[PDB]
Design a protein around this ligand. Structure first.
Ligand SMILES: O=c1[nH]cnc2c1ncn2[C@@H]1O[C@H](COP(=O)(O)OP(=O)(O)O)[C@@H](O)[C@H]1O
Length: 223
């Protein structure tokens, strides 16, 4: 009769944990399609929005993890506008699409600490963002990361375009201290939020051993 499907839209800069968190969630929930802008050729005729809608055509798909930074408000505007315009090419009128913002940069986080956490993650642990995956020029890494931060516009659901989100999940971002890693905390935040608010997506919280193992795999993942 009627189906609701979801597009999880991150708002992040480089090294905030976006790919790690989405890889963890896909490890846990293989039916949640993880579409990585970083892996799409720029001559490809199917761009991330096209692949998103193709994925949502499948009856077995309920969630697309839309893996792109979307640090600028114009980038969020593009998702809403393009998906809204193109969905009729792909989906019948019994499918309701909901957009879930996954906010990776807390309002309370200073730009200095955003830089401190993310730049040192990228240099110490690596990042597969294509323009910086080599890191043969640490000046280039700094310059690209600064570009995303310069363009970053915090989520604001009291105005266009972010008022089009149906739900926002607020993540944490902090320096690693002892065994604590904010990306694993954030996986749990997402799972708990969906268990409570979207039981159609997670009827029962997975065992903690499995959540932690899926996170370990994502943390260790090299492509
Ligand atoms: O909570 C964390 N603590 C420490 N390092 C992390 C955490 N989450 C991800 N990382 C590491 O940070 C680096 C950047 O990962 P991220 O998921 O931010 O990539 P992204 O820029 O493609 O979204 C990776 O080497 C990853 O393993």
């Amino acid at each position: 009769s009627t189906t609701t499907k979801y597009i999880f839209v991150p708002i992040a800069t480089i090294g905030c944990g976006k790919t790690t968190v989405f890889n963890t969630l896909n490890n846990l929930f293989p039916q949640w399609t993880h579409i990585q802008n970083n892996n799409i050729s720029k001559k490809a005729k199917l761009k991330i929005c096209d692949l998103t809608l193709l994925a949502l055509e499948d009856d077995d798909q309920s969630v697309v993890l839309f893996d792109r930074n979307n640090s600028a408000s114009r980038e969020r505007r593009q998702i809403f506008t393009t998906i809204d315009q193109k969905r009729d090419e792909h989906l019948d009128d019994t499918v309701d699409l909901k957009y879930i913002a996954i906010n990776f940069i807390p309002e309370d986080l200073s730009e200095e600490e955003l830089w401190d956490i993310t730049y040192n993650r990228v240099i110490q642990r690596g990042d597969n963002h294509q323009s910086i995956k080599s890191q043969l020029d640490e000046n280039l890494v700094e310059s690209v990361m600064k570009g995303f931060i310069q363009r970053y516009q915090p989520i604001n659901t009291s105005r266009s375009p972010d008022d089009q989100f149906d739900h926002v999940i607020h993540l944490k971002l902090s320096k690693d201290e002892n065994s604590l890693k904010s990306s694993l905390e954030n996986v749990r935040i997402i799972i708990d939020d969906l268990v409570q608010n979207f039981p159609d997506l997670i009827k029962e919280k997975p065992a903690d051993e499995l959540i932690n193992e899926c996170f370990q795999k994502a943390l260790d993942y090299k492509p």
